[PDB]
Every structure is written in structure tokens, then in C-alpha cells.
Design a protein around this nucleic acid. Sequence first.
RNA 1: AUUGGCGAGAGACCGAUAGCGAACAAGUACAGUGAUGGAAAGAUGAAAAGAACUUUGAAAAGAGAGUGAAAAAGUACGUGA
RNA 2: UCGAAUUUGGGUAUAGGGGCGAAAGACUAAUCGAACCAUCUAGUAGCUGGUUCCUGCCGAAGUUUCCCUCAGGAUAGCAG
RNA 3: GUGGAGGUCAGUGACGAAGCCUAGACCGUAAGGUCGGGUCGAACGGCCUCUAGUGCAGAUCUUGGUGGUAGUAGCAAAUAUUCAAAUGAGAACUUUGAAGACUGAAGUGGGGAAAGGUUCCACGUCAACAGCAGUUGGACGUGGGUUAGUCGAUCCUAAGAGAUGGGGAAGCUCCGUUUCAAAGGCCUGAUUUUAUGCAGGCCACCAUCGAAAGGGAAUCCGGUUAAGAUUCCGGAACCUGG
RNA 4: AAACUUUCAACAACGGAUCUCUUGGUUCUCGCAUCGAUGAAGAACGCAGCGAAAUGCGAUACGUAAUGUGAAUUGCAGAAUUCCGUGAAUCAUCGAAUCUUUGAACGCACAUUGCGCCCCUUGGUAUUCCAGGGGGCAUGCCUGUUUGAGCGUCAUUU
Lengths: 126, 119, 99, 207, 71, 87, 50
Amino acid sequence: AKQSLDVSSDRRKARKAYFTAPSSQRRVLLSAPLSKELRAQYGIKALPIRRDDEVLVVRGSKKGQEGKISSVYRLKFAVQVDKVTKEKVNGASVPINLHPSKLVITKLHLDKDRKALIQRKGGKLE
Amino acid sequence: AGVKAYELRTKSKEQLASQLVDLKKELAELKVQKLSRPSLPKIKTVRKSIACVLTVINEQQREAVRQLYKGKKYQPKDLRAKKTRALRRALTKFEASQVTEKQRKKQIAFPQRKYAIKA
Amino acid sequence: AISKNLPILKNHFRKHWQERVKVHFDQAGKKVSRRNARATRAAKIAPRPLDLLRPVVRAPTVKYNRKVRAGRGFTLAEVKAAGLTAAYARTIGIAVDHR
Amino acid sequence: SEKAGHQTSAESWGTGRAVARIPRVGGGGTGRSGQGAFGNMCRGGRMFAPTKTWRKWNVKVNHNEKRYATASAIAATAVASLVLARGHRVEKIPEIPLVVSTDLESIQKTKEAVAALKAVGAHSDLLKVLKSKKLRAGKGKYRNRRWTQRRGPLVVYAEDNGIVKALRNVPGVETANVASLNLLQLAPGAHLGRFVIWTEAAFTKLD
Amino acid sequence: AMKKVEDGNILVFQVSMKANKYQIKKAVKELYEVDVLKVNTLVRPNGTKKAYVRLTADYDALDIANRIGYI
Amino acid sequence: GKGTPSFGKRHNKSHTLCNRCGRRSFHVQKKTCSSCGYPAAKTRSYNWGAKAKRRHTTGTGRMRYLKHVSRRFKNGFQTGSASKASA
Amino acid sequence: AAQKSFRIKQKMAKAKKQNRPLPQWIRLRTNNTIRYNAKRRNWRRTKMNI
RNA sequence: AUUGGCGAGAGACCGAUAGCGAACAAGUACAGUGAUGGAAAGAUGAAAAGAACUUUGAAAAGAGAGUGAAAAAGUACGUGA
RNA sequence: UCGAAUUUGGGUAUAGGGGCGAAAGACUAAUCGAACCAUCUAGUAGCUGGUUCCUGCCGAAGUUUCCCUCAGGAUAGCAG
RNA sequence: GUGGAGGUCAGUGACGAAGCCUAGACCGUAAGGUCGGGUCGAACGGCCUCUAGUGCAGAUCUUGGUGGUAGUAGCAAAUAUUCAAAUGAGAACUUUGAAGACUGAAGUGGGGAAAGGUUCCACGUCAACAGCAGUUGGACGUGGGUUAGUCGAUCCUAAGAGAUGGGGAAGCUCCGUUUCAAAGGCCUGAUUUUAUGCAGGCCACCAUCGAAAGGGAAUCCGGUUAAGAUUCCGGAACCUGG
RNA sequence: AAACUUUCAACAACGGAUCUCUUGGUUCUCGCAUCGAUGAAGAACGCAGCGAAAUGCGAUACGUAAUGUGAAUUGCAGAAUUCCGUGAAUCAUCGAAUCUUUGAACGCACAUUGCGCCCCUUGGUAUUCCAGGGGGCAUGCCUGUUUGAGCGUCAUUU
Ligand SMILES: [Mg+2]
Ligand SMILES: [Mg+2]
Ligand SMILES: [Mg+2]
Ligand SMILES: [Mg+2]
Ligand SMILES: [Mg+2]
Ligand SMILES: [Mg+2]
Ligand SMILES: [Mg+2]
Ligand SMILES: [Mg+2]
Ligand SMILES: [Mg+2]
Ligand SMILES: [Mg+2]
Ligand SMILES: [Mg+2]
Ligand SMILES: [Mg+2]
Ligand SMILES: [Mg+2]
Ligand SMILES: [Mg+2]
Ligand SMILES: [Mg+2]
Ligand SMILES: [Mg+2]
Ligand SMILES: [Mg+2]
Ligand SMILES: [Mg+2]
Ligand SMILES: [Mg+2]
Ligand SMILES: [Mg+2]
Ligand SMILES: [Mg+2]
Ligand SMILES: [Mg+2]
Ligand SMILES: [Mg+2]
Ligand SMILES: [Mg+2]
Ligand SMILES: [Mg+2]
Ligand SMILES: [Mg+2]
Ligand SMILES: [Mg+2]
Ligand SMILES: [Mg+2]
Ligand SMILES: [Mg+2]
């Protein structure tokens, strides 16, 4: 249950805040859980998805397909994975939008800021 | 591309003026080429570089004037704080804290004592 | 109009009374605010007891002179008899009434 | 809103123009022009007898009658047939009223509070809750009233030593001090027979 | 406008709506190192200002336009 | 002839654009805006004209300066600048 | 009037530049709900009143 | 005290002819010389995957083929009196 | 009728119980025996119209007295 | 019988909730309830209670939608069209040619003022619009186009409007336009790093706004564009200030 | 007998009711006090590679600077990909600036993008004419400064 007077349970306010969230807030909203291997290797549960991460689809018709993120398309709350596409009738390939909550992160794109974030969350960072 | 403000801030007044003139010449050439090209998205970078150079030149000029007026009465109004019209009208801390020494003697002799009730 | 056997009523509602209807929806909210204000003031003036000592006085009129009640403040004669000045009594939490 | 349906300068055209006498929007050139206004029968008009804030909302009840109803509800909690009819799965409870040791008042964790309730027999009632959870039927589901469920047991203590926070997250389970004993909790929906689990100190303090 | 460049020795510019004929003359001389014979101005129906700058006989407006970059 | 033939004679203008409110309510011969009251110092408004007040009131424009007052107050009308360099 | 003030000419210039159909790429934007220029003004239908 | 401003939390309230006039580029379009008057208008699909290709037609389009869980969802788009 | 008490453009002045009128209560933006706009205002109406599901039981009055009362009320009667 | 609320049936449901259609079935005197079939796609019931913005055939009711009338009235003023070719899917209506007519110089011609605002011109182009039609268009889409010392404005004052001094008005403001006001700028001395120093009078005119037909400094001819010209080009002049 | 008319059903129309939905409204409660001559509210015009709006902004024009975050924006194009970084972003934050023409609106005026004056400076031979750049010139009132007026008036001086 909810205890603080600074937080609201209004569904209308929650949905307005979600749909009008700016890009920086959408970064956090688009978080993906780590795989078992990375969870053991890093000691953390979920991270905000990045463009060069490697992911595995665990839900939907594309479940089981691996790949690398190609775009974190924050404007429509979706990520695009290379080699996960739909083939249109006119020979063209179109990326398929996926939600990071339905993915799992298998290999993490790392730099100074990501490593600092992992340690800030309590990551061993093998 | 585009210039960087922290890099401009190490340059002197004349170097910045020369850079501004060069950027305006480059913008003129780009505006000429735009009439021939279907799209020239590179004009935006040069425009923003011009804006940044003007910002740094203004910063140096205003800081020099602040140095001239440092530690003296009657600063220029654009260099004075712009809190609010009513806030600038309001009495200063010293003026608001002025008391007659009849009241100063009263306050000194009989301040609000702190006390506790036992039971 | 007048009909049947009913008492004569005097409902004063011939002005624009609906413009000046006060409903105390905020009774609970203001009780909470008063309790918060008291807690804040107690913390601010701690350990002072949040209210001055008041004298005992006789209520006026024939209807209430059988009762005593708290007055505004002690008289200057009462403070002098107790052995302190009015200025100091006001600083140590005694309400003083000069009139 | 007090001004709803009246933000208009509409006047009746009167008779003689083969139209109803309703006040009509003046001017021209928009489509709203010449339309009926101000009437409860009119689209965009003012409703009949607009709702007022000074409608009576709270109802005064005599203190003695409130205590009468609370006492009756408490006595109804000790009738096995009333609790069963009210809807609690007390068919296998040893005895009603159900009194457990005062050790329950000091239980800190939700896990052990639930284990204690299941040990003393509230497992079926707890399972009836969180199995009865349903989406609300109607428009209340987007007025912050999305989900409905059944009420579970009410645990009555004498001194809060962690039992309230231990049972706070358990669905349907309510907690109460003997000093208060809300009638809303004792007879939900005005139906007597709340399933109540007493601590020993609470049971003694009832006198 | 491009016919005027060679058929009349006239350059056609879009200019600031705040500029007058003296300013246009001074600006053209400064920017392009030419001597100006005359400046004719009008306000276009789109709210911008167009200037016909006839250069002197000592400068070929087509050569100036080539140096500037257009055509 | 007070109708259609008389309407054919409407080719003057009683009102032109007002410099203050930009509305084409500047009465030419009275030299007064019928909407905003220009050139009077005060802006024309009436309590019986609640809709007109709503049409021209604060917040219906840009609030070029006033829109930042709430942020400046909430930060306390601070002066100077933020310090830390970079991460 | 063929003898017009600059203020009138400036208003006419703004109206001329506004008199255009909706750009086509607008319709392809994510969550677009604009289907046409609803403020389209023509000289034969509605007068702009100075 | 507070039908204004700013920041919050709520409801046995209304649910697109309702609720503010305005859920949408609404005090907008539009009317009037002017003061002023002042609308209508939300919903494809999880995803455009918005129908490649063939054929008839000047073309719109039709007929196939195909996409889709559904075209008894084709942008004249939920249901469809 | 047509060389003047002529016709007419533009500018300008007069504003609502006010103007203007070779005077018709004419005209004053299709509005005139008091313009138009908004507000008071959901103005008042003994007067016209309407007033939304079923079944069951009982079941009238248009008469008395008073009223600037006579298309309305009070009053008694009839009814539940 | 309807919207919402407390409780309960650990009620129904993407294996199909709600809604809608159904001369298909059942229950109730009735208000109504229930079931099957079709369509559909996301929520919804029974019971006990609570609550109301709770039930429509009418109000020349409100808003919206739709009929019969009815392929009906009407598209009959302004003398009037015809042949051929081209283009085009398509020609009574577009283009060209030929012919027949009309306006008949207080024009159906050539320009302008107010007003409009791009309607001008070109290219593409016909879903809507054009009293039929349309390949055409003042339509639609995209662009191009308005060049001044001399033409106007700008200056002057007209009937008027209107600050200031001052007076009135609770006040929004009103009067008044030179008034009961201490209401200003000309020449000359000028060492021209540089602007002044004292000179001696000079009317007493009181701000300002008010005319694209009144007053008023000065430009013509020829040529030139798809569309500009007393404005551009060529030539030939003139005025003002210095 | 058909046609026609009428009734019912199925399918197809017309139309947009019903059901479900909801970034909107409405009401109640709580907290806070902050517009403007340092030029507000409001108005006009303009600014984007490709925008008519809405939103944002002001010739530094969907923005500059600073701070945080830490890799986007997205309809297309373009660019970036040294992205393990003083660094993407129509991000957030915001304390430095810019802020056209206006507006109480302030040189005068304004149905004009009209007409002046003062200081510094530059160019045209130039204190005087013309032009460009920068900075200025409203009213009432207050305190003070300076220069004054009045046989209002004091003393001293011809
Ligand atoms: Mg329902
Ligand atoms: Mg010109
Ligand atoms: Mg007039
Ligand atoms: Mg017309
Ligand atoms: Mg509505
Ligand atoms: Mg609407
Ligand atoms: Mg719909
Ligand atoms: Mg289906
Ligand atoms: Mg469908
Ligand atoms: Mg449909
Ligand atoms: Mg005669
Ligand atoms: Mg009339
Ligand atoms: Mg009147
Ligand atoms: Mg009425
Ligand atoms: Mg009967
Ligand atoms: Mg009658
Ligand atoms: Mg039927
Ligand atoms: Mg169904
Ligand atoms: Mg769905
Ligand atoms: Mg009702
Ligand atoms: Mg009906
Ligand atoms: Mg013909
Ligand atoms: Mg046609
Ligand atoms: Mg043409
Ligand atoms: Mg066109
Ligand atoms: Mg002239
Ligand atoms: Mg003049
Ligand atoms: Mg011509
Ligand atoms: Mg010539």
C-alpha cells in the first residue's frame, strides 16, 4: 500500500505522466532485466537499455530470437533489434518494435558511465 | 561540429572578433550554396557557432565592466540584481532591523526568558 | 400564501444568499492544521508550555457571578504582591493585565 | 459548475417565427447561432436543479445508538452461524470467538504473521481473499476503484507491537485496537458476523 | 533576376528590411569590392526587401556573380 | 432602398487596426480603440464583460517574462551560477 | 487600394505566406492527428478584414 | 477570508448532445463597422504489417492476389441501432 | 425634375430619453412611438404548453363564507 | 427497470464480457425476466442493502440524422449563333481559322479613386467549385512578378481634433486652445587641440494632429517583360541641399 | 399474371445511436506568496534543411551560455558513431546572456514603418551639408547640487 502524501494513486495522473514523460525519464522507463549469467556476474537485476546492448527476446512471437539493439526509439516506448524485422510484400524490411520489459540483456555495452552506474547500484563488475 | 564555449573563453577579444567575422563569411557562403542545394543542414551549426561567439564576447565585456564597478556604490542597472520590483523596493536587512535604543534597552533588560514547568 | 394550521415561519432567504454559503468541508483539515501548528510552536518554544499562566476572576452579571473562570492576566497589584515586576513576569510566562 | 450552461447572452425570440419560445443564441455565422440555450431540455444547456455543495453529506448518529450497534456487531462476531452466513470460511475453526495468544501482537514480519493466522485457522478465509479479486463492473473502475475483493479476518489487539505493519500488506485482513472497534469493520455492508481473531489481552480488555 | 546579371550589369540581392540605399551601397562595396552605380529597392509581396544594385561599367556583374558563387 | 441597394455603399471604414491590441477596432474619427481603450493608459475592461476579460487576460499571450517568475522564486531569486564542472 | 500603408502590406504578406496546404511529411509523424490545414483562407470565400 | 496565481492529494461527481464554451492547431474556425457573438470535431490494428504483383479501365476504381487473429478492421477505418 | 432650396465624392460635427427632422413619429448601419451590445437575469406571470414504468385497493368537486374576489386564493364540505 | 456505492455469490468471461439483429423458444396479469441463433471483441452479472442528474410520444420541446413531396418546381431578362480543324478517354461550351452578330465613344473600349489582396503571369493540372458541361477558369498544386531626387505619401493649413498652464470632478476623467504661466531662438564677435565666455535687442506669433480630389520645388521621349515601368535601358533635361 | 403499393427476414446501404474506453472536465482538501520604468500583462512581425498551425523563441530567433544526466533525435534527409566522453538529446535543470517593432510606453508624432534635437565617432574637401555606427532627450513628485528672480527683506556699503 501507499504511505507517503507526496505520491499519487490517481490512474489519470499516472497515465498522463507516463505518456508525457520527457526523453530522460523515458530512458529509465525503458529498463530491461538482465539474464541469469549477467545477474550473477554483476549482482544487479535490471538496467536501462542502451543502443549497443545484446538482448534475447523472451516474450511474444519473436521469443527466442537474439540480437543487438539498433535503436532505443524513446518516442514510442520501443527498442529496435537488428535481424529482428518484418518482411513486407514489396521486398522491403521494416524493424519490429519491442518493449525492453519483454527482453533480457545478455551482453552489456560498457563504458565509464555504465560501470559507474553498476557500482552505484551495487555491482561487483567482474 | 561547431565551436565550444570553454575553448572560446581562453581567447582574447581580437581573436574572438576575427573568428566572428570568419563565421559570418562562412554563413554567407553557405547561404549562397543553399540556393543550389535541395537541403543544407550545415547552416545550423554555423549559426549556433556565431551565437556562441557572441555569448562569450558579451561575457568578457560584462565581466570587465563588473570589474570596473567592483566595490563601489551605483552599479549599472543591468548589472544590478533583478530579483523583483517589490523585493527591490523592500527595506534592507539593516533598515528593517533598526530599533530605537529605548527598545534596545528594553530588549536587553527583559528578553524572553526560557523556562520549563516541572509539575 | 397561507394555508392549513402551521406555525408562522421566518426563513430569511430573500437576498442572494446562495452567493454566501459557507460549508465547513475543511473541519477535519483545519483540525489537523491546528494540531500541526501547535506541534510546530511547541517545538519552536521548547520547553516553554505553549500558553501563559492566567488568573482566576469572577464572571460578571447575575447569571454567571456564581462561577470563577480564567481571566486575561494578573493585575499589577497581584504581581507586586507575588514579588516580581510585570516586565519580568511577562518574560517568564505570566499574563499581565494592566486594566 | 455554477456557471455551466449560462455563459451565453441568449434571449427568447418570442412567438411569430414558427419556432419554440426557448431562448436562442444571438449573432450569426457559426452554427451555434440561433440554437436553444439555458434549458434543461437544450443541448449544452443548464441541467435541472444543478447539484449544490451544500447538500447534506455527513449524517449525525446518536452516540448511544452508535455504541448499541457496535455492541451488537461485537456479539454477532461470536455467533458461528452469523459469521458463516456473512461469508467467512470458518467451517473448520475450533471455536468462536477465536482467541490467540498475546504473542501475536509483537509479530514483526508478514511471513510469520500469515503463518500464525494459517496455524490458527484463517487460511481458508485468506485464500478466499486474493481469489475473489475482480475488476469492478462499471465506471467506478476509472474513478480509482478498479478492483474489488472480499473481506478477510479482522485481528483485534490490545497493544500495537508490530502486528499492524505485519498484517498491513495481507489482502483482506484488517487490524483494530480494542479501544476503537470500527462498526464499518465489524459489520461490513451492514451484515453482521465479521470473522474476528482476538489476542488474549484484547479479549481481557473488552470487559 | 539572372537575366539582369548579364543583360543589365545589375546584381539582385535580398536585403534586410531595415537597410536603406546608403547602407546597401556601403555593404555591397565592403563585401564584394565593387563600385556601385545605383541602388533601386522594393518590398516584395512576401515581406522581404529586394535590391537591384547596378554596378559601374568598370565591373562585370556576371564575373562578380561567378566569384560570389551563384551561377 | 434601405437594404440591398444601401449595402452597396459600404466602402469606407469606421475602424482600422489598433496599435495596442491589433484588432481593427481603432475608431478612425474618435482616435480610440473600441476594444482595448487605446490611447487611454488603462486597458478597457468591464465586469459585465466576463468573456471579454477571459479573451484578453493574463495567460492568453506569451507571458514572455512572467512565465519564469515561479521558477526564479522557487530557486529563491538566486544569483551567480552553478559550480561543478563535469562528470 | 494600390496606395496602401506599410502596415496593410505587411499583413497581406503574412496572409500570403500562410496561404498554403498542409506539408505532406506532417501526416507521417508519430501520433499525428492533423489531416489538413483547417485555417486555410481564400480571397473569394472569407475576407480577412484588414 | 480566498470561483485569481503556483505546487500537491483526493471523490458513492461527468463520461464526447455529458463534463468548462473548449478531452482535438478552442476563445480556434467563422459572424458583426463595433461593442461583442462564438461552434463543430475523440476510438484502424498489438504492430502499417496502410494491400507488392497480375488483369479490365483514360482514370477514379473494379476483379483477383496478398497483410493481418479479424478487411463482417482498408485510413469514407472499434462496435455499428 | 433637369442650372439650382440642384446632384454628388471625401473630410468633419451632432449618440439613445440622446441626436437629427422643409415635420412622415420620419431617420439614427435590413433595428425606431426610444438603436445596438453585455450584465442585473434562470426578471415576475392568478396565463398557454408539456410533465417519462406496471399492477392492486379506495375514490371526488364544480357547492358554503370572506377576499380590488369574478380565468385566482383562503375557508368548510366531498376523498385517501 | 437504470447509473453509481458497501457486502456476498472464492459469480460469468478472449474456449468470447458488454452491445446490437432475430414474424426462433420459455416464464410473468404487467412493468419485464430468461434461453437459442447471428454479429462482436473486453469487460459484466445474481442476491442483500445504500444512493440518485433513475424510465418519454407529445412541450410550434433541444441537438443530429432521414423521408414523401420529387427526378417535381426551377436552370425562359440582357437580339445569336454556325462550319471545319487541332487537342483530348471524352468537345454545344477549350484553342485556331472561317462566317454571322452585338456593344456603337455618358461603350460590352482605354484608365483610375474607395474596397479587395495576389484575384496579375507562367507551368502542371480537374477530386471539389463554375446555374449543364468542361480538355477551360478569378478553381486546385507549384513558382515568378510591383525598381522613382522629378508620380504620390511625407510638408501646409480647412471645417475640426487635442496635450500643456490652470480650473472642475469621489473618480473613470471634464473644460479650454492662448488662456489669470517666470512658457523661447536669431545674427555677431569665436583662440577653430573644442566648444564656448560676458555683449545688445527680436517678436510675443504658444504644442501637436487634420486633405493619396484643396495648397505644393523639380522629367520627358523612344525601347524593353510571360507578368513592371513618367520608376528599368538608351538618350535628353530639370529642382533642392551642399 | 406482372408492374406498383405495403409487411416481414437476410445481405448490402444511409446514418452515427448503443456498448466499452479516457493525457479532459467538475467539486473538495492541503501547502505556498512570486508581476511591472532593471519596462509587465497584452499586441504585431519574424525565426527551422524540408512547418500552415499549436508549442518555443527574437536578427545570438523551435534558440546561445551554465549545471546535471549519460547516447540519442526520428516523418524524411543529413550528421555522428575517437560514444571508456568537458559529451548526443525536440532531455532535465537553469543562477549568465540575447530579447525585432510595440505596449503603463518615455524626444515629437503615429490611419505615416513620418519628423526632430544633443554627445562621441567614421566617410564624403567639412564646426555648418549629407550619410553610417554607438549613446542619449517624457511627466508629476522627493532629497540634495548648481545657477538665478522678487525694494519680500536684513546688515554693510556712494
Ligand atoms: Mg453497464
Ligand atoms: Mg520605392
Ligand atoms: Mg467615418
Ligand atoms: Mg464579395
Ligand atoms: Mg462537448
Ligand atoms: Mg466541442
Ligand atoms: Mg466512431
Ligand atoms: Mg472480428
Ligand atoms: Mg472490426
Ligand atoms: Mg466501421
Ligand atoms: Mg419639366
Ligand atoms: Mg433602420
Ligand atoms: Mg433608448
Ligand atoms: Mg426568461
Ligand atoms: Mg378498481
Ligand atoms: Mg383555462
Ligand atoms: Mg423486428
Ligand atoms: Mg456475446
Ligand atoms: Mg481490444
Ligand atoms: Mg432529470
Ligand atoms: Mg422522442
Ligand atoms: Mg454556348
Ligand atoms: Mg459543372
Ligand atoms: Mg488569367
Ligand atoms: Mg493559383
Ligand atoms: Mg511632387
Ligand atoms: Mg500635417
Ligand atoms: Mg501594365
Ligand atoms: Mg532613364
